[PDB]
């Protein structure tokens, strides 16, 4: 905490864009299509949208 | 006139002349009339105003500027040459001072002097340009009643501005001098010297 919401909400955006470019580069061979973050208390979670989950 | 008393004093000289007649600053729109037909319905002195500051939309139609009162059309033409644009609160002071000075030199109604100046200094026969090829000859045409009022205010305020420029006499006085010398056809005014010069050029080109 101790960060203004203007810098907080922007930092959530750049964090998402860094994650998305990571998985395009990493899971290129598994048909990756997107992510979404769910910022919750007690273990914020990340979902990967990729066709071959048996490979991911 | 049975003055009314109330918790705010509202001084005695205010309501005495304004509850019954809505004058100018202190001047009357009664007994003022456009002596020149073809300028009635273009010189507007029929609905009186208190000051010449009306935040009115007159530009949104073709002929709506004719319904603007001509005193405000003179304060509007004073805010000119750049350093005075959008300085209407200075232009009302100049006009308020002008109508006081006009009354002093000639004891008639200063509103009537303005209308006399407008009715005289509008050109009556103007010249247009015919290009063809080459010499670009000129052609003499008529002039609209609206343009006569439009150009008379132009010539008067240009002449007052140029006379008062590098001069110790203020803009209020030179505007007063120009309006008085144009109410009669004195030809000591900038506008009258301009008006007959435009007319004699068209006379050659008719």
């Amino acid at each position: 905490a101790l960060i203004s919401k203007k810098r907080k909400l922007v930092a959530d955006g750049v964090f998402y864009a860094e994650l998305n470019e990571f998985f395009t580069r990493e899971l290129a061979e598994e048909g990756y299509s997107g992510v979404e973050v769910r910022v919750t208390p007690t273990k914020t979670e990340v979902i990967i949208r990729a066709t071959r989950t048996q490979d991911v | 006139f049975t003055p009314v008393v109330l918790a705010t004093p509202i001084p005695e000289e205010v309501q005495q002349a304004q509850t019954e007649i809505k004058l100018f600053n202190k001047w009357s729109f009664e007994e003022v009339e456009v002596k020149d037909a073809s300028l009635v319905d273009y010189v507007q002195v029929r609905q009186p105003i208190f000051v010449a500051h009306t935040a009115g939309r007159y530009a949104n139609k073709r002929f709506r500027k004719a319904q603007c009162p001509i005193i405000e059309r003179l304060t509007n033409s004073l805010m000119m040459n750049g350093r005075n644009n959008g300085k209407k609160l200075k232009a009302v002071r100049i006009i308020k001072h002008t109508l006081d000075i006009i009354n002093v030199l000639t004891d008639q109604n200063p509103i009537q002097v303005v209308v006399d100046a407008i009715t005289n200094t509008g050109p009556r026969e103007d010249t247009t340009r015919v290009g063809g090829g080459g010499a670009a000859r000129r052609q003499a045409v008529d002039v609209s009643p609206l343009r006569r009022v439009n150009q008379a205010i132009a010539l008067l305020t240009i002449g007052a501005r140029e006379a008062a420029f590098r001069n110790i006499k203020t803009i209020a006085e030179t505007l007063a001098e120009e309006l008085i010398n144009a109410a009669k056809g004195s030809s000591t005014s900038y506008a009258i010297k301009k008006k007959d010069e435009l007319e004699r050029v068209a006379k050659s080109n008719r």
Binding site: - | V4, L6, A7, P9, P11, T54, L89
Partner: protein, 141 residues
């Protein structure tokens, strides 16, 4: 119980708020009398609602106007916007509605936007010029 109407008047950023209650006849703007609204050449602009319908109508009401926003000329157009609406809306509620039309007829026939605020609003600036329509000078060689 103390019959009172509050209303507002507007010009271009300015918002005058009027508090029209029944009383003795003080007409005060920002705590100061109406005789002190000082661009001093537009001092009569706060005076048309007091003179178009006559000064007698204000002898039993109290006016208290506060202005914010706008400029020196825009605010002066905002008190008169609120005075006119503040008297015709007093008459709609606490005296005969026949009298309201007679004052509404007076203000509208002399419409310097005393009752209806004008819809002229600033146009946004664009790129490539210093104004909404004005463009930078181009050089061509």
């Amino acid at each position: 119980a103390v019959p009172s109407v509050q209303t507002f008047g507007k010009k271009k950023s300015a918002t005058a708020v009027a508090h029209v209650k029944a009383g003795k006849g003080l007409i005060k703007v920002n705590g100061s009398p109406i005789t002190l609204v000082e661009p001093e050449i537009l001092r009569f602009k706060v005076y048309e609602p007091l003179l178009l319908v006559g000064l007698d109508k204000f002898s039993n009401i109290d006016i208290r106007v506060r202005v914010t926003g706008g400029g020196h000329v825009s605010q002066v157009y905002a008190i008169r916007q609120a005075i006119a609406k503040g008297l015709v809306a007093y008459h709609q509620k606490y005296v005969d509605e026949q009298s309201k039309n007679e004052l509404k007829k007076a203000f509208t026939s002399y419409d310097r936007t005393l009752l209806i605020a004008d819809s002229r609003r600033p146009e946004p600036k664009k790129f490539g010029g210093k104004g909404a329509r004005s463009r930078f000078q181009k050089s061509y060689r």
